[PDB]
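Batch 3, record 17
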Amino acid sequence: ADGLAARGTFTEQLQAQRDLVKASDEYYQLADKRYRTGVDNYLTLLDAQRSLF
Amino acid sequence: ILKRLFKEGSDVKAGQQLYQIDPATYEADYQSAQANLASTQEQAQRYKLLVA
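Prediction for the assembled complex:
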């Protein structure tokens, strides 16, 4: 029964976690675009990279 | 006045330079405004790239 509860809840948890990772990856990509155009510096890019990690 | 650039008794034309009143403070605040343009045009172009 604990194995069945884990099967039932980890699909929802892992899909929420993949959406977490997709959101943080898109945030890092926008911070990289903001850096490459030239508005913010490289420290904020490294902070976004650590959040994605 | 630094120069007088018209011959007296001549057919002058609309848009011809006559005198030269010494530009010192006018070149000064022209450069002071040109610096603001050189910064804020960079701001406008960076944000026009980033809105897309």
